[PDB]
Amino acid sequence: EGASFNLEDSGNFLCTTVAKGDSDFLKRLLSSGMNPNSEDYDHRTPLHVAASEGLFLMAKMLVEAGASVISKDRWGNSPLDEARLCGNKKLIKLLEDVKNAQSS
């Protein structure tokens, strides 16, 4: 039938979702179609949070959800760059592939 979450700070809620690590909850959220590109008061995406804490799994779910790897936080660099600094080379290369496809 159709409903929109329209949660206040939905992006921040997703960032926190990413933070706590309830994987099933975030798969359900992206299943409904919640935009992972929504930022926060820090203007950081949930993808930023996943990269910063190095959540390869959660970040790739957000990537299939359409999160922008090239949307850069106000001071914090692109989520891919955030991943580069945090480490988790696997995450860096995956987000690198994303970034290529996205920038195209």
Q: Which residues are at the interface with a copy of itself (CB under 8 A)?
A: 8-9, 12, 15-16, 18-19, 21, 23, 40-42, 44, 49, 52-54, 56-57, 74-75, 85-92
Pick between residue 32 and residue 41 the one whose CB is nearest to a copy of itself. 41
In whole angstroms, the minimum distance from the beta carbon of 58 to a copy of itself comes to 11
In whole angstroms, the minimum distance from the beta carbon of 89 to a copy of itself comes to 4
Pick between residue 2 and residue 85 the one whose CB is nearest to a copy of itself. 85
Instruction: Measure Cα distances from 42 to 39, 46, 75 in Å.
Output: 7, 11, 9
Alpha helices, DSSP H, located in 45-88: 46-52, 56-64, 79-86
Question: Closest by alpha carbon to 63, among 81, 50, 82?
Answer: 50
